Design a protein around this motif. Structure first.
Motif, PDB file in Angstrom:
ATOM      1  N   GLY A  58       0.841  -1.196  -0.030  1.00  0.00           N
ATOM      2  CA  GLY A  58      -0.069  -0.014   0.113  1.00  0.00           C
ATOM      3  C   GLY A  58       0.639   1.057   0.069  1.00  0.00           C
ATOM      4  O   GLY A  58       1.838   1.222   0.135  1.00  0.00           O
ATOM      5  N   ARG A  90      -7.459  -0.288  -6.585  1.00  0.00           N
ATOM      6  CA  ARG A  90      -6.767  -0.418  -5.227  1.00  0.00           C
ATOM      7  C   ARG A  90      -7.725  -0.509  -4.042  1.00  0.00           C
ATOM      8  O   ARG A  90      -7.370  -1.302  -3.218  1.00  0.00           O
ATOM      9  CB  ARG A  90      -5.893   0.711  -5.048  1.00  0.00           C
ATOM     10  CG  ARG A  90      -4.371   0.854  -5.547  1.00  0.00           C
ATOM     11  CD  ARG A  90      -3.724   2.013  -5.526  1.00  0.00           C
ATOM     12  NE  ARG A  90      -2.338   1.974  -5.734  1.00  0.00           N
ATOM     13  CZ  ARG A  90      -1.529   1.677  -4.889  1.00  0.00           C
ATOM     14  NH1 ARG A  90      -1.705   1.360  -3.780  1.00  0.00           N
ATOM     15  NH2 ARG A  90      -0.263   1.655  -5.372  1.00  0.00           N
ATOM     16  N   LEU A  91      -8.899   0.191  -4.220  1.00  0.00           N
ATOM     17  CA  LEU A  91      -9.953  -0.154  -2.983  1.00  0.00           C
ATOM     18  C   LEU A  91     -10.542  -1.266  -3.082  1.00  0.00           C
ATOM     19  O   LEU A  91     -10.679  -1.941  -2.035  1.00  0.00           O
ATOM     20  CB  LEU A  91     -10.893   1.054  -3.329  1.00  0.00           C
ATOM     21  CG  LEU A  91     -11.956   1.291  -1.971  1.00  0.00           C
ATOM     22  CD1 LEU A  91     -11.269   1.764  -0.881  1.00  0.00           C
ATOM     23  CD2 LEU A  91     -13.101   2.144  -2.542  1.00  0.00           C
ATOM     24  N   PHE A 141      -1.395   8.774   1.273  1.00  0.00           N
ATOM     25  CA  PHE A 141      -2.320   9.583   0.617  1.00  0.00           C
ATOM     26  C   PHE A 141      -1.448  10.468  -0.568  1.00  0.00           C
ATOM     27  O   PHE A 141      -2.062  10.724  -1.584  1.00  0.00           O
ATOM     28  CB  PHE A 141      -3.053  10.354   1.530  1.00  0.00           C
ATOM     29  CG  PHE A 141      -3.747  11.768   1.060  1.00  0.00           C
ATOM     30  CD1 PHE A 141      -5.016  11.483   0.464  1.00  0.00           C
ATOM     31  CD2 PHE A 141      -3.349  12.869   0.766  1.00  0.00           C
ATOM     32  CE1 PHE A 141      -5.880  12.492  -0.258  1.00  0.00           C
ATOM     33  CE2 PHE A 141      -4.058  13.888   0.322  1.00  0.00           C
ATOM     34  CZ  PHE A 141      -5.096  13.804  -0.452  1.00  0.00           C
ATOM     35  N   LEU A 172      -7.534   4.094  -8.465  1.00  0.00           N
ATOM     36  CA  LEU A 172      -7.696   4.060  -7.179  1.00  0.00           C
ATOM     37  C   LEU A 172      -8.888   3.149  -6.700  1.00  0.00           C
ATOM     38  O   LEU A 172      -8.889   2.493  -5.735  1.00  0.00           O
ATOM     39  CB  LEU A 172      -8.069   5.647  -6.567  1.00  0.00           C
ATOM     40  CG  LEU A 172      -6.973   6.587  -6.779  1.00  0.00           C
ATOM     41  CD1 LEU A 172      -7.594   7.821  -6.301  1.00  0.00           C
ATOM     42  CD2 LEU A 172      -6.036   6.240  -5.434  1.00  0.00           C
ATOM     43  N   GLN A 173      -9.800   3.196  -7.551  1.00  0.00           N
ATOM     44  CA  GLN A 173     -10.932   2.046  -7.206  1.00  0.00           C
ATOM     45  C   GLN A 173     -10.346   0.765  -7.393  1.00  0.00           C
ATOM     46  O   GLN A 173     -10.953  -0.008  -6.808  1.00  0.00           O
ATOM     47  CB  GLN A 173     -12.147   2.332  -8.384  1.00  0.00           C
ATOM     48  CG  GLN A 173     -13.578   1.539  -8.133  1.00  0.00           C
ATOM     49  CD  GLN A 173     -14.461   1.736  -7.174  1.00  0.00           C
ATOM     50  OE1 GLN A 173     -13.756   2.970  -6.410  1.00  0.00           O
ATOM     51  NE2 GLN A 173     -15.458   1.218  -6.789  1.00  0.00           N
ATOM     52  N   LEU A 222      -1.047   8.364  -3.546  1.00  0.00           N
ATOM     53  CA  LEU A 222      -2.183   8.098  -3.931  1.00  0.00           C
ATOM     54  C   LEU A 222      -3.258   9.092  -4.554  1.00  0.00           C
ATOM     55  O   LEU A 222      -3.750   8.752  -5.654  1.00  0.00           O
ATOM     56  CB  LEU A 222      -3.296   7.524  -2.837  1.00  0.00           C
ATOM     57  CG  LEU A 222      -2.706   5.979  -2.243  1.00  0.00           C
ATOM     58  CD1 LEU A 222      -3.616   5.844  -0.914  1.00  0.00           C
ATOM     59  CD2 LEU A 222      -2.873   5.036  -2.878  1.00  0.00           C
ATOM     60  N   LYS A 223      -3.117  10.347  -4.311  1.00  0.00           N
ATOM     61  CA  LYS A 223      -3.894  11.405  -4.776  1.00  0.00           C
ATOM     62  C   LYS A 223      -3.658  11.624  -6.284  1.00  0.00           C
ATOM     63  O   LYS A 223      -4.288  12.181  -7.078  1.00  0.00           O
ATOM     64  CB  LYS A 223      -3.859  12.688  -4.134  1.00  0.00           C
ATOM     65  CG  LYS A 223      -2.405  13.315  -3.978  1.00  0.00           C
ATOM     66  CD  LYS A 223      -2.208  14.361  -2.861  1.00  0.00           C
ATOM     67  CE  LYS A 223      -0.842  14.952  -3.180  1.00  0.00           C
ATOM     68  NZ  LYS A 223      -0.525  16.467  -2.404  1.00  0.00           N
ATOM     69  N   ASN A 224      -1.945  11.265  -6.592  1.00  0.00           N
ATOM     70  CA  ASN A 224      -1.760  11.531  -7.952  1.00  0.00           C
ATOM     71  C   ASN A 224      -2.119  10.212  -9.217  1.00  0.00           C
ATOM     72  O   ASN A 224      -1.632  10.347 -10.123  1.00  0.00           O
ATOM     73  CB  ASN A 224      -0.315  11.615  -7.927  1.00  0.00           C
ATOM     74  CG  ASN A 224       0.020  13.092  -7.381  1.00  0.00           C
ATOM     75  OD1 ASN A 224      -0.603  14.223  -7.346  1.00  0.00           O
ATOM     76  ND2 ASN A 224       0.977  12.927  -6.503  1.00  0.00           N
ATOM     77  N   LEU A 225      -2.762   9.377  -8.348  1.00  0.00           N
ATOM     78  CA  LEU A 225      -3.167   8.128  -9.069  1.00  0.00           C
ATOM     79  C   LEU A 225      -4.597   8.539  -9.962  1.00  0.00           C
ATOM     80  O   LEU A 225      -5.121   9.406  -9.571  1.00  0.00           O
ATOM     81  CB  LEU A 225      -3.240   6.972  -8.370  1.00  0.00           C
ATOM     82  CG  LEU A 225      -2.013   6.389  -7.889  1.00  0.00           C
ATOM     83  CD1 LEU A 225      -2.405   5.311  -6.693  1.00  0.00           C
ATOM     84  CD2 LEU A 225      -0.984   6.197  -8.866  1.00  0.00           C
ATOM     85  N   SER A 226      -4.730   7.807 -11.049  1.00  0.00           N
ATOM     86  CA  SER A 226      -6.119   8.067 -11.591  1.00  0.00           C
ATOM     87  C   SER A 226      -7.226   7.581 -10.743  1.00  0.00           C
ATOM     88  O   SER A 226      -6.970   6.532 -10.202  1.00  0.00           O
ATOM     89  CB  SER A 226      -6.005   7.449 -12.925  1.00  0.00           C
ATOM     90  OG  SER A 226      -6.368   5.924 -12.901  1.00  0.00           O
ATOM     91  N   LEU A 227      -8.561   8.099 -11.033  1.00  0.00           N
ATOM     92  CA  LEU A 227      -9.574   7.445 -10.197  1.00  0.00           C
ATOM     93  C   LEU A 227      -9.716   5.920 -10.437  1.00  0.00           C
ATOM     94  O   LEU A 227     -10.168   5.363  -9.547  1.00  0.00           O
ATOM     95  CB  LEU A 227     -10.962   8.260 -10.347  1.00  0.00           C
ATOM     96  CG  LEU A 227     -11.003   9.826  -9.909  1.00  0.00           C
ATOM     97  CD1 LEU A 227     -12.195  10.320 -10.220  1.00  0.00           C
ATOM     98  CD2 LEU A 227     -10.987   9.520  -8.365  1.00  0.00           C
TER      99      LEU A 227
END
Lengths: 51, 50
Positions: free
Chosen positions: A1, A18-19, A4, A15-16, A7-12
């Protein structure tokens, strides 16, 4: 992992992804833990039934 | 320990050993769940920041 700040610089969509991955990983970990304790209990249970 | 040790103990001693595992297991499971919930938050926050 990651944190933040990274992570914030990853694409949406990344991120989904990864979630979503956290759920089977978590289920795998808890399953292993439950089996770990089942294995611990087994020789004690047998010893009680062996008396 | 091993069955070869445990078989020689009293029923009361063995019951105590079984019961001792319970809160240990409870604790480790709660820690596992807290770690999952933790890992979710920075991802959720990253999604909401975009």
């Amino acid at each position: 992992g990651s944190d933040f700040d990274f992570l914030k610089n990853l694409s949406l969509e990344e991120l989904q992804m990864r979630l979503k991955a956290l759920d089977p990983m978590m289920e795998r970990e808890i399953e292993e833990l439950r089996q770990r304790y089942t294995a611990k209990r087994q020789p004690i249970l047998d010893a009680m039934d062996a008396k």
